[PDB]
Amino acid sequence: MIQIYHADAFEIIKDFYQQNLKVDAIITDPPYNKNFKLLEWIARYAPLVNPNGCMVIFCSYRFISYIADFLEENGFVVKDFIQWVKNNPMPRNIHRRYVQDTEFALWAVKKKAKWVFNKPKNEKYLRPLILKSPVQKSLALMEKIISIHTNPNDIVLDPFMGSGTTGLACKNLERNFIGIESEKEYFQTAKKRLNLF
């Protein structure tokens, strides 16, 4: 099942309250990254998650401490952080500074939740991909995140879905996606990648 909306996440959320919607996991990459604003989508969307559900939020090292504390204020337990590295950076300036090859994501679960994890064998580390693509997002990255923290019929929610790619990953993994995007061009891009019409 794939269902996407063209809307403002801070408005359709009220409609989700009326429908008493339940989703298994929110896997998203929020905008930006008073800090409330916007940690606030978290406080607003946190009630949708099932007792055993989790969250995965992509972010910047200048924020993650704030996001994590906020999550644990809203009824989640932060288990760990995951990362993925790009092999071809911008660079940009290599004689005065490090290249930023690395992006981060936060992983938190509901408080008394029995969470998924789900671990192919092997036994496994903190960084899903060495990836390729230079300069988002790679389908392969999202597929491995979604392969890990969700199971086949669990409901995945991406309040900012952008191009899709969270939804596309869920589809290939047969995971029942719901997603939201504000701007029409990205919405139409996600909608075409996901067929429908």
Binding-site residues for S-adenosyl-L-methionine, please?
8-9, 137, 163, 165, 181-182
Q: What is the 3-state secondary structure (H, E, C) of the chain?
A: CEEEEECCHHHHHHHHHHCCCCEEEEEECCCCCCCECECHHHHHHHHHEEEEEEEEEEECCCCHHHHHHHHHHCCEEEEEEEEEECCCCCCCCCCCCCCCCEEEEEEEEECCCCCCCCCCCCCCCCCCCCCCCCCCCCHHHHHHHHHHHCCCCCCEEECCCCCCCHHHHHHHCCCCEEEEECCHHHHHHHHHHCCCC
Smallest gap from Cβ 125 to a copy of itself, in A, equals 4
Residue closer to a copy of itself by CB (options 43, 139) is: 43
| Residue with smaller CB distance to a copy of itself, 97 or 112 | 97
CB of 124 to a copy of itself, least distance (A): 4
Nearer to a copy of itself, 160 or 186 (CB): 160
In the complex, least distance from residue 1 CB atom to a copy of itself, rounded to whole angstroms? 22
Residue 123 vs 185, nearer CB to a copy of itself? 123
The Cβ of residue 115 has, within 10 Å, a number of other Cβ atoms equal to 16
Closer residue to a copy of itself (CB): 40 or 174:
40
What residues line the site for a copy of itself (CB under 8 A)? Answer: 13-14, 17-18, 20, 36, 39-40, 43-44, 47, 60-66, 68-69, 73, 78-83, 85, 89, 91, 94-102, 104, 107, 115, 117, 119, 122-127
State the Cα torsion 8-159-21-47 to the nearest 10°. -100
- Residues of the binding site: 8-9, 137, 163, 165, 181-182
Minimum CB distance to a copy of itself, residue 26 (Å): 16
Task: Find the shortest distance in angstroms from Cβ 115 to a copy of itself.
Answer: 7
